[PDB]
Design an enzyme around this catalytic site. Structure first.
Site, PDB file in Angstrom:
ATOM      1  N   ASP A 111      -2.310   1.799  -6.511  1.00 59.05           N
ATOM      2  CA  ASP A 111      -1.852   1.947  -5.131  1.00 59.05           C
ATOM      3  C   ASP A 111      -1.933   0.853  -3.930  1.00 59.05           C
ATOM      4  O   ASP A 111      -1.323   0.768  -2.836  1.00 59.05           O
ATOM      5  CB  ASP A 111      -1.123   3.141  -4.430  1.00 59.05           C
ATOM      6  CG  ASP A 111      -2.243   3.512  -3.552  1.00 59.05           C
ATOM      7  OD1 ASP A 111      -3.521   3.226  -3.343  1.00 59.05           O
ATOM      8  OD2 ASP A 111      -2.452   3.956  -2.086  1.00 59.05           O
ATOM      9  N   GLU A 112      -2.527  -0.190  -4.307  1.00 61.63           N
ATOM     10  CA  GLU A 112      -2.983  -1.441  -3.284  1.00 61.63           C
ATOM     11  C   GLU A 112      -2.794  -2.747  -3.885  1.00 61.63           C
ATOM     12  O   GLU A 112      -3.749  -3.202  -4.780  1.00 61.63           O
ATOM     13  CB  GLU A 112      -4.026  -1.033  -2.817  1.00 61.63           C
ATOM     14  CG  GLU A 112      -4.000   0.305  -1.816  1.00 61.63           C
ATOM     15  CD  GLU A 112      -5.297   0.003  -0.487  1.00 61.63           C
ATOM     16  OE1 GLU A 112      -5.804  -1.384  -0.540  1.00 61.63           O
ATOM     17  OE2 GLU A 112      -5.677   0.605  -0.078  1.00 61.63           O
TER      18      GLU A 112
ATOM     19  N   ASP B  22       0.944  -1.314  -0.231  1.00 62.71           N
ATOM     20  CA  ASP B  22      -0.338  -0.028  -0.349  1.00 62.71           C
ATOM     21  C   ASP B  22       0.906   1.295   0.019  1.00 62.71           C
ATOM     22  O   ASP B  22       1.563   1.707   1.386  1.00 62.71           O
ATOM     23  CB  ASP B  22      -0.917  -0.103   1.056  1.00 62.71           C
ATOM     24  CG  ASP B  22      -2.084   0.746   1.423  1.00 62.71           C
ATOM     25  OD1 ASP B  22      -2.018   1.854   0.565  1.00 62.71           O
ATOM     26  OD2 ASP B  22      -2.999   0.954   1.968  1.00 62.71           O
ATOM     27  N   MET B  23       0.336   2.285  -0.921  1.00 61.32           N
ATOM     28  CA  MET B  23       1.225   2.667  -1.528  1.00 61.32           C
ATOM     29  C   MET B  23       0.945   4.043  -0.335  1.00 61.32           C
ATOM     30  O   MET B  23       0.244   4.346   0.265  1.00 61.32           O
ATOM     31  CB  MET B  23       1.763   4.017  -2.962  1.00 61.32           C
ATOM     32  CG  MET B  23       2.497   2.332  -3.509  1.00 61.32           C
ATOM     33  SD  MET B  23       3.451   2.153  -4.073  1.00 61.32           S
ATOM     34  CE  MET B  23       4.702   3.677  -3.576  1.00 61.32           C
TER      35      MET B  23
END
Ligand code: MG
Length: 329
Positions: free
Chosen positions: A101-102, A7-8
């Site tokens: 982003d995940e 996760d960013m």
């Protein structure tokens, strides 16, 4: 099972600070700059001011007048997302994209230890993009994503079984993660707030929740998830033959469907309009267009077009919009 969740950290804002040195270390808030604009994401500096995602932008500006407020550079963000997912697939093919982003990775059959694997994700990502990624490690999807969001900024956390629900007790169910923001209050209203107060103590999906709170999930990392359709409908308050109000509904549908396409990193080429008429029949008509579309007003234009040349024979009590024939990956 060895499940990693990536996760960013404040994705869009971190991209903006990475591309603009002069924004680093300062509060950065990415979102809609027009009137009803909403915060998409904001850096951890900005969160210290009380700003969070989905918050209206004029409020965020009130909380943080000196903040750097930016619009959503969607295409740059998708660039960086692809150069991250490349590393993710290079580590293992068993990647279940969640969002731009995940991801989840199923590394149960990978040689390196999951901890070393997360360290390699982190290193590879910061070398490639300058950005940090929070990584969770567990035997579950629910637990691995708890672990990723835990030591949130540039985090790394393992959750093994010994720490079956003991470590989860003090968690506010606001952070339930599993299924929240639909029982934010109907649990704060009936008096329990911590996983503790609900730990093995409505939605009729509780067999997930009561199970998820334990160490038990079992849902598999799903590579190859294919979405065929995305749509929205509304049963109406009263029957109608007024194309005008039908089309207002279609407008709002277009906005919702656009948002889901954009979130899925997808485009569409067929638009379908559905009505339920007063004799309980369902009628659908669709149009296919040459060029991929994803924008709220493009979808709306096709849908509006379809409705206008329909010739409603009977009264309508349900209206729905749907998109299919979707772009790849
Ligand atoms: Mg994120």
């Amino acid at each position: 099972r060895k499940i990693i969740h990536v996760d960013m950290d404040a994705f869009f804002a971190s991209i903006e600070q990475q591309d603009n040195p002069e924004y680093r270390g300062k509060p950065v808030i990415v979102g809609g700059l027009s009137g009803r604009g909403v915060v998409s994401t904001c850096s951890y500096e900005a969160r210290k001011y009380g700003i969070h995602s989905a918050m209206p932008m004029y409020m965020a500006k009130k909380l943080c007048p000196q903040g750097i407020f930016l619009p959503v550079r969607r295409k740059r963000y998708e660039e960086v997302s692809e150069q991250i997912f490349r590393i993710l697939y290079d580590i293992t093919p068993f990647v279940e994209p969640v969002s731009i982003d995940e991801a989840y990775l199923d590394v149960t059959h990978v040689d390196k230890n999951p901890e070393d694997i997360a360290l390699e994700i982190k290193k590879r990502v910061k070398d490639a993009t300058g950005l940090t990624v929070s990584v969770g490690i567990s035997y579950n999807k629910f637990l691995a994503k708890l672990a990723s969001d835990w030591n949130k900024p540039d985090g790394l956390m393992v959750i093994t079984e010994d720490m079956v629900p003991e470590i989860l007790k003090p968690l506010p169910v606001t952070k339930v993660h599993g299924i929240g923001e639909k029982s934010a209050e109907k649990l704060r209203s009936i008096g329990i707030e911590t996983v503790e107060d609900l730990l093995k103590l409505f939605g009729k999906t509780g067999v997930e929740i009561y199970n998820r709170i334990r160490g038990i999930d079992e849902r598999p990392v799903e590579t190859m998830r294919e979405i065929k359709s995305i749509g929205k409908e509304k049963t109406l308050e009263k029957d109608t033959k007024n194309k005008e109000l039908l089309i207002q509904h279609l407008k709002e549908f277009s906005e919702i469907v656009s948002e889901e396409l954009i979130k899925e990193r997808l485009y569409c080429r067929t638009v379908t309009v559905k009505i339920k008429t007063a004799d309980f029949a369902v009628h659908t008509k669709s149009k296919t267009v040459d060029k991929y579309i994803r924008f709220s007003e493009d979808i709306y234009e096709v849908a509006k077009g379809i409705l206008e040349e329909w010739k409603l024979e009977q009264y309508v009590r349900l209206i729905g919009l749907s998109v299919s024939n979707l772009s790849p990956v």
